[PDB]
Amino acid sequence: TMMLYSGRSQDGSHLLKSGRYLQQELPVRIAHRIKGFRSLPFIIGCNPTILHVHELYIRAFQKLTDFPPIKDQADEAQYCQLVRQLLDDHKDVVTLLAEGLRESRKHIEDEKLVRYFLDKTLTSRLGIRMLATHHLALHEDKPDFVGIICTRLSPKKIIEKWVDFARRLCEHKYGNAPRVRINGHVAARFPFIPMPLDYILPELLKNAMRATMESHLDTPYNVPDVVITIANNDVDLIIRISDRGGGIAHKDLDRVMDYHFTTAGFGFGLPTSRAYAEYLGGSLQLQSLQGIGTDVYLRLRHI
Amino acid sequence: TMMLYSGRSQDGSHLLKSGRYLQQELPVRIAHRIKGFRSLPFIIGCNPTILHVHELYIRAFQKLTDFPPIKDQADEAQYCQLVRQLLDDHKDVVTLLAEGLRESRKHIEDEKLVRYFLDKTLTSRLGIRMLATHHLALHEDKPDFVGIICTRLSPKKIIEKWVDFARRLCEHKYGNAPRVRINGHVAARFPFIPMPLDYILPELLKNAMRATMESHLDTPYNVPDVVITIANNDVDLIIRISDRGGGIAHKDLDRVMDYHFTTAGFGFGLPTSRAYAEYLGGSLQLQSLQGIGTDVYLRLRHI
Ligand SMILES: Nc1ncnc2c1ncn2[C@@H]1O[C@H](COP(=O)(O)OP(=O)(O)O)[C@@H](O)[C@H]1O
Ligand SMILES: Nc1ncnc2c1ncn2[C@@H]1O[C@H](COP(=O)(O)OP(=O)(O)O)[C@@H](O)[C@H]1O
Ligand SMILES: O=C(O)[C@H](Cl)Cc1ccccc1
Ligand SMILES: O=C(O)[C@H](Cl)Cc1ccccc1
Ligand SMILES: [K+]
Ligand SMILES: [K+]
Ligand SMILES: [Mg+2]
Ligand SMILES: [Mg+2]
Structure with missing residues (x-):
């Protein structure tokens, strides 16, 4: 359109x-x-x-x-x-x-x-x-x-850009930040529009880092890495962001996608990101392992 | 009932x-x-x-x-x-x-x-x-x-039981089998009925191993581990089985849950496992990273 x-x-x-x-x-x-x-x-x-x-x-x-x-x-x-x-x-x-x-x-x-x-x-x-x-x-x-x-966008590079950004916010608030490892199709390069990633990536990264720090209040100096996997195929680009931040509770799960809902920005990160992803022909899906962590899957269609 | x-x-x-x-x-x-x-x-x-x-x-x-x-x-x-x-x-x-x-x-x-x-x-x-x-x-x-x-069932133990089983089938067919690492709540023990796990686990493990071997035909002697994460909370038991076997193709994704569908048992593993999981109050969900691998999430309610 x-x-x-x-x-x-x-x-x-x-x-x-x-x-x-x-x-x-x-x-x-x-x-x-x-x-x-x-x-x-x-x-x-x-x-x-x-x-x-x-x-x-x-x-x-x-x-x-x-x-x-x-x-x-x-x-x-x-x-x-x-x-x-x-x-x-x-x-x-x-x-x-x-x-x-x-x-x-x-x-x-x-x-x-x-x-x-x-x-x-x-x-x-x-x-x-x-x-x-x-x-x-x-x-x-x-x-x-x-x-x-x-x-010729590199998913690895734009991810690293927002990783540095989120880690600095996190370090400011908590005195430390999880390290982020990136794996999968790290050398991928393809035509792509950065702007939606520029909104979505920092929101998902801030969420993962907050969750990690808040679940490790006793060892802020030693927290589990966030692990990001890139999968690039002919149909879509998948970015999986996996944390060990304790998961999204069963009692919260059906509310995290509501505008305004927060357990703490202003509860807009998830619903806005999903809306953007779907608008562009992709999706944003959450897998919660309560007691362990959360995997967030961002999918965006290729151009 | x-x-x-x-x-x-x-x-x-x-x-x-x-x-x-x-x-x-x-x-x-x-x-x-x-x-x-x-x-x-x-x-x-x-x-x-x-x-x-x-x-x-x-x-x-x-x-x-x-x-x-x-x-x-x-x-x-x-x-x-x-x-x-x-x-x-x-x-x-x-x-x-x-x-x-x-x-x-x-x-x-x-x-x-x-x-x-x-x-x-x-x-x-x-x-x-x-x-x-x-x-x-x-x-x-x-x-x-x-x-x-x-x-006092140990998820780790029953998982290891079926891992040994699946690895032997796999080794028989391909000459090798991925190693399996288990992480998360490895020391968990709780009341539970083994029988459904006894059907489901080997089906998911066979799938992950087959996928891994078939995507590494050039290096059967050196394939990526399958990684299993256990999350135990007051509500459910989650078992995530993550492979680097290349993923489920977009063209196949809407058919893998159909009885009889197979890209090769007889195409019953997935639909039967999901039916069993839901019957017992849980679920079976798939996350495909096409080009990389698949995460399968088995959730079962506690008794
Ligand atoms: N990776 C995660 N781990 C644990 N909880 C999460 C994660 N991502 C989001 N959440 C939960 O979802 C809620 C809503 O997130 P979001 O919409 O981004 O708003 P906000 O971060 O402003 O609260 C968060 O407050 C948090 O409770
Ligand atoms: N972990 C996986 N990785 C890749 N493909 C998979 C995976 N699990 C299932 N599949 C696909 O789903 C199809 C259906 O699986 P299933 O119902 O267990 O039947 P079968 O293993 O007998 O083919 C498989 O043939 C395979 O193509
Ligand atoms: O950001 C907004 O809310 C509007 Cl779309 C900004 C705008 C840009 C171009 C033309 C008209 C409005
Ligand atoms: O496995 C089957 O198909 C039936 Cl339910 C076996 C059975 C067991 C007990 C009583 C009657 C039938
Ligand atoms: K929200
Ligand atoms: K099938
Ligand atoms: Mg947020
Ligand atoms: Mg099968």
């Missing part, structure tokens, strides 16, 4: 076609988000933070539609400025929704409703930001990238 | 109550199996091997109902002889059903039907044999057993 244009061209004609495609596509997608807010239960839609986000989307739609049809490179250039502005203006939207919904959702009893709204809203948003960021990136001169598409 | 009597008594009164319970229970359960055969699609029910099994059940029902009410230890003793006879007469039933159904099932188009019949038939049969074997075992003087209930 959403096209990431991979074409390049000397005169910069492909930038024009891309820009014109965005211009047709973005207002429509934003209008769908606005309809989602309009259909929220009244009591939730009246929450001042939800109203703020609703108004941001209306404002986005207005600016996008106010922008004249792109006729030349000069126009396309100014359109990119608008798109950059909107991307920035909306950067905290996930956090505002989480906040606005936290209490308000407790009112209504159809708890399916908020899950559906958040799944639909956050995944459409991911898709919108991918499209827009892709267009902007077409102007960049990065080797191994066409827009936001890496032509 | 099915009670395994754990009571013991000096005068041998508990043997009488147990026997009388069997006498009430067995004919009813067998009649249900007979109704299952009666409702099989005509073309399948007419298969001579299916008819043979159908007739065995009728004959079982006749003998059980022909047996007079148990009034004393002398009677109970003779009833045990009948039960032993029937257990033996029916020992090859799974194999006969597999054979009788193999071709005949291809006729009818509702493929849900055979799955349902086999799930229902095989699990009811497991339950019946557990009840009967339990009663017979009440006469035995084994330490750590009440009937077929082990009062």
Whole structure:
């Protein structure tokens, strides 16, 4: 449904076609988000933070539609400025929704409703930001990238990037962090879009590390490694993240995938990651060994 | 629904109550199996091997109902002889059903039907044999057993028993076998009924070993270990069997749980194991890392 244009061209004609495609596509997608807010239960839609986000989307739609049809490179250039502005203006939207919904959702009893709204809203948003960021990136001169598409992504490398990140957060909080071993198809390289991994990987790694530290309070200086296995085949990329952090309790298991649920970010890591994975044609599955640890399986389809 | 009597008594009164319970229970359960055969699609029910099994059940029902009410230890003793006879007469039933159904099932188009019949038939049969074997075992003087209930089963020990068994089959066929490492709650001991593990474990181990050998045809002398993790908590026992045997292909994944499906026993290992696990209140789940290996998770509820 959403096209990431991979074409390049000397005169910069492909930038024009891309820009014109965005211009047709973005207002429509934003209008769908606005309809989602309009259909929220009244009591939730009246929450001042939800109203703020609703108004941001209306404002986005207005600016996008106010922008004249792109006729030349000069126009396309100014359109990119608008798109950059909107991307920035909306950067905290996930956090505002989480906040606005936290209490308000407790009112209504159809708890399916908020899950559906958040799944639909956050995944459409991911898709919108991918499209827009892709267009902007077409102007960049990065080797191994066409827009936001890496032509030879290494799962091992991007995993290591987020491992370093998560380990530093963990070390800050607990004074130590599990080491991470990576095995399986460590030398794999293939065309792939980093952005979803950039959201999902740190969420899963933070979870695994927290769980490991909290279950080893007596030996923070000596905790079990987290073990990550990469499997690359013609159909999908599988990343298994296995910890010895004690598992997800039976009493918690049916709730960990709910937005807002946490035993402690703000309980969004798992449901958001799963929503993103499925949006892109993959999945996120959990296997809990209560008393031992948890295996988390991220699957993403190849391009 | 099915009670395994754990009571013991000096005068041998508990043997009488147990026997009388069997006498009430067995004919009813067998009649249900007979109704299952009666409702099989005509073309399948007419298969001579299916008819043979159908007739065995009728004959079982006749003998059980022909047996007079148990009034004393002398009677109970003779009833045990009948039960032993029937257990033996029916020992090859799974194999006969597999054979009788193999071709005949291809006729009818509702493929849900055979799955349902086999799930229902095989699990009811497991339950019946557990009840009967339990009663017979009440006469035995084994330490750590009440009937077929082990009062302090070690998952590690019973796993090692079947590991040795599977490794010998594997070595016979391929000239070598993966080593198996066991980790997690290796010292766990708890009350538990071995019989279902005795069916399931060798099936899962044979699968893992076959997969490992067939994916390492160039280095049969040096193959990846199978790794088994035990997790014991207050709710269930989890046994994870992880291999590096290349995984279950995407094109096969939705078929491996079908009776008769095999890429090579006779394609019964997985569906039978899952049926047994669920019958007992647990589950059997597969995680395939195509190109790398497979994790199989057996969960069984504590007693
Ligand atoms: N690897 C894991 N081991 C144990 N528990 C986990 C793991 N991953 C997630 N959880 C549980 O799931 C809950 C929800 O996780 P998440 O949605 O990422 O939100 P948060 O981390 O903000 O609590 C966590 O609070 C934790 O209880
Ligand atoms: N651990 C495993 N690794 C790879 N493939 C497996 C594994 N376990 C089962 N399979 C696949 O599932 C199929 C069905 O298995 P099963 O029901 O046990 O029957 P059988 O072993 O008789 O073929 C196997 O033929 C094999 O292709
Ligand atoms: O992040 C958001 O919530 C929106 Cl989709 C940002 C946006 C980007 C491009 C055009 C319009 C809105
Ligand atoms: O294995 C079988 O198919 C039956 Cl349940 C054997 C049996 C055992 C006890 C009483 C009747 C039948
Ligand atoms: K959550
Ligand atoms: K099968
Ligand atoms: Mg989290
Ligand atoms: Mg098998």
